[PDB]
Symmetry: C3
């Protein structure tokens, strides 16, 4: 005649024997209605935390924006001829890509001109928080991060003498955060009055 | 209503009478071009702050990343007997989920070994900012956040003597931010030289 | 022998060849290797820091954390006193903040009030550039990130630590100026500066 179908270009296909005309569709992205209509299979957007589904729209995960917990653990000082430890109760605040360990004021013993203050995160963290969550973005690299000046009260029983010492995040290894404390010179003493200190550093992600 | 030849499998359908061949399409998901082409319906994704439209593309609202304003208000000290206030002009910087109150150096009066420094945000905040914008993510919980060592000059008219005192964000209550100032020992004085100080803490979002 | 008069779009029957095909918008649809019509997977128009994190929409890890270092000159100037020291500091860009982790160093005399300038014109290692150190407040004079720092002043003997006030004052043409003042002073010729971390919101454009 002057009107019929000889060939059929994909996705269309005409079976040469039965002459049935059908269409090839990718079932993972398309489907056919109960009404026999061709439709697109609705799929939800693929989001990577911190990007998330907030109130139906695409937003920022509130967990990422603010998370709180606390650590009830052992803080230990180590220096030339010295080694002691104190139990401390500190709040933990994870805001964006930063972790903040809010240490309270505490009493310690003698300190050398240079020493290390170690926070043991292997134990003490309130679930669902874990040791791994305290890892810095720079992992276990030795750095001089967040250096700050801190005034510690040194005494031998009498009125304390406040020495200004330099403190910074030095390294995190196997769940133990090591802080370097040094400088300011030293006087003979047996006790120390440490001020409340907030230690912050970029937290490791993904 | 009508009848179609079994030869065209849905979504295709051959009208047995008119012998017109057409296709069934779910209009809510598919449409036909001006060029007669089958196309997918363009969907508009819902974005939730901080995720916003950045020049047609999907990005992070510049408002969330950085905002600047200022507070011209009253800073008041209170410490067992001693009580006084000073007017201060400070810049406010909201960067990501943090608020930064950049207090300038100011002169105050006597201070006790332990006391509170209150910033009154119910008044003095410059638009667009509102008192509510200063609420911490931990809203009114008593904490020991952002503890730091600060050197204050104490004097009685003569050359000042600088005492190292411990300062931290203690609590935010009904628009008033209370900072704890203590430790470091005291000396007899009538005036105090406070250094410029930046108070930072995670800002509330909902 | 099998009449088929007319094919409604997107279908189209060529009256000459009698070939039946379909019109599809290639920007939204495509045809499989298996000859199946499928939805064309395209990525949306994303703006940094929002990136295409392995298949989906995520936050670029580059925005969350980026490290580098500066090997440059730190120079002090105040009431006629001028001097410089070479310093090696780590630089950490986390979110919208830049952190210059300065190490402890030795300097010379300092006045009651002076400026400490970090020259970012040179010394920045990849992927950093001078422009990357610009604050969000550009070259506005501010009193940002004020903190108390203890510097050791000496004349050769045991140092005396004076508590001085320090803050980010201004960034200009690649040079970050820090104000150092207050706390009084004493006669000295040398200074022991402690390690200091300078942080401020980084510019984005």
């Amino acid at each position: 005649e002057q009107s019929y179908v000889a060939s059929a270009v994909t996705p269309l296909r005409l079976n040469s024997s039965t002459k049935v005309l059908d269409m090839l569709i990718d079932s993972s992205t398309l489907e056919i209605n109960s009404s026999g209509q061709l439709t697109v299979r609705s799929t939800s957007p693929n989001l990577r935390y911190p990007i998330a589904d907030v109130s139906g729209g695409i937003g920022m995960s509130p967990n990422y924006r603010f998370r709180q917990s606390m650590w009830i653990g052992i803080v230990s000082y180590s220096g030339s001829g010295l080694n002691w430890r104190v139990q401390v109760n500190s709040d933990i605040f994870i805001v964006d890509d930063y972790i903040h360990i809010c240490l309270p004021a505490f009493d310690g013993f003698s300190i050398a001109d240079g020493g290390d203050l170690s926070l043991n995160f292997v134990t003490g963290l309130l679930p669902p928080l874990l040791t791994g969550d305290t890892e810095p973005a720079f992992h276990n690299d030795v750095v001089t991060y967040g250096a700050q000046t801190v005034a510690i009260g040194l005494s031998s029983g009498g009125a304390p003498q406040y020495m200004s010492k330099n403190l910074w995040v030095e390294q995190w290894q196997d769940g133990v955060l090591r802080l370097r404390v040094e400088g300011g010179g030293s006087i003979t003493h047996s006790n120390s009055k440490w001020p409340a200190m907030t230690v912050s550093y970029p937290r490791s992600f993904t």
